[PDB]
Chains A and B, each alone.
Chain A
Amino acid sequence: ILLRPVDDLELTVRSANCLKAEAIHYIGDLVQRTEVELLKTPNLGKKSLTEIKDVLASRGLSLGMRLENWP
């Protein structure tokens, strides 16, 4: 799952633009950045963070987890 475009996430265009601001290209990139790091962003506010974390929990992989030897 960690190898799919952030496009395949069904998020509001505001969130997609904000994620392109930090050059997040694929998923998994989004998960190795915590909530406080993400929120310090132009236009990536509260409701967008709740939406992104709820969609992440639908994926089941909330923000924060670490893995090995990526990539």
Chain B
Amino acid sequence: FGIDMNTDHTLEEVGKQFDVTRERIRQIEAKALRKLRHPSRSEVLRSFL
């Protein structure tokens, strides 16, 4: 999502920067979004909507 960087990236570029493939990166992102969808770490960001 291009935060604190000069450009945005697809999962190919993130896969190449690490030693990791398409589906792996896709499901690390999925895991991150489930982690942040938890109510414990989301009350602060709710007020931003």
Contact = CB atoms under 8 A, between A and B. Distances in A.
Interface residues of B, number: 3
- Classify chain A: how many residues form its interface, as a range: under 10
Contacts of A8: 38-40
Contacts of A10: 38, 40
A8 B40 CA distance: 7
Interface string A6-32: 001010000000000000000000000
A57 to B, nearest CB: 15
Contacts of B40: 8, 10
B19 to A, nearest CB: 26
A10 B39 CA distance: 9
Interface of A: 8, 10
5 contacts: A8-B38, A8-B39, A8-B40, A10-B38, A10-B40
